[PDB]
Design a binder for this molecule. Sequence first.
Ligand SMILES: Cc1nc2ccc(C(=O)NCC(C)C)cc2n2c(-c3cc(OC(C)(C)C)ccc3Cl)nnc12
Ligand SMILES: [Mg+2]
Ligand SMILES: [Zn+2]
Length: 342
Amino acid sequence: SAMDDEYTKLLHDGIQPVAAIDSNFASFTYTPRSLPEDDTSMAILSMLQDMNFINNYKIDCPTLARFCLMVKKGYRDPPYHNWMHAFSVSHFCYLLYKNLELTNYLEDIEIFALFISCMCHDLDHRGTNNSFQVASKSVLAALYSSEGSVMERHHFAQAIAILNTHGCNIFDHFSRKDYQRMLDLMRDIILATDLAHHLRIFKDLQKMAEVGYDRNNKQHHRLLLCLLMTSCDLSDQTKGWKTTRKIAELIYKEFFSQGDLEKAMGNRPMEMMDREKAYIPELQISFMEHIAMPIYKLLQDLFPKAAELYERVASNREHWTKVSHKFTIRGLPSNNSLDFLD
Ligand SMILES: Cc1nc2ccc(C(=O)NCC(C)C)cc2n2c(-c3cc(OC(C)(C)C)ccc3Cl)nnc12
Ligand SMILES: [Mg+2]
Ligand SMILES: [Zn+2]
């Protein structure tokens, strides 16, 4: 068994220093997708240690090692919603911890829950959205469609299934109340990754940012966790052009595969899922304007040091505007043929 061998080294070789992973590993300029996938499990452990969670919560190391590999093994390999997504999302949570002084805003247990939620938040994704679940009458829809957020409820249930696997419950020494609290947090945070959820709380996120964050306000803590989670989920937009270009390729590959399956079921895909209709520059620009930029604008409003993140997202958006003309074929194709017209 490969996982047993991986586990054996992960446990007995010891948790490597974060600075050994990369000199700039804790910088907003670092691209965690640059890390070899074979090194990501060790890096998860390194981050957990560097944030003092292992020490503070007296996490059993054999259990944590098993847990981390189980979570990694719990992602499938669609083009975007795979383990490297969860890892880069978790890495961004670490960056926020290192760069934004979250301990002034959130409880220890809340920040811990956020990071664990980042690792788990897309568990067992099949490369299709919630609507496809319902449309295809999937098992996941049979379970959760009456509640909404079908995939996100599944992601959360998968995280719990991993905890309930023998030798994997990294929380099982917690007090009853802390155990209860952690799982409730993971619920709310993972459910916050449903865009329907974000749209529903957006006015509140705005009011919070307007009046000013009140660390004594429990609803403010919950809203902030949702915002932070969604900013981790979108963190590929905060790197350079190459990263936003690459992730566009990945997510549209994934989208168009869904659309192809929808067409085969005789249904009309959303335009952005339809490879015959989707115009990537416009769709990406729209996603940045309506989803990504307002989330980072909110983050900047709440955290002055998050300003560079918003500015990088806005810049990447402008770069999409600049390259859009390249999606129009001028002259002939690079094979000198108009055969594609037939
Ligand atoms: C690169 C990139 N393009 C996207 C393009 C379109 C959309 C989309 O759903 N548009 C809405 C429909 C109605 C037109 C999302 C996109 N997206 C996300 C994303 C954002 C999410 O929203 C929150 C809850 C804030 C995380 C949730 C899940 C995902 Cl996968 N992540 N990266 C992307
Ligand atoms: Mg998701
Ligand atoms: Zn995600």
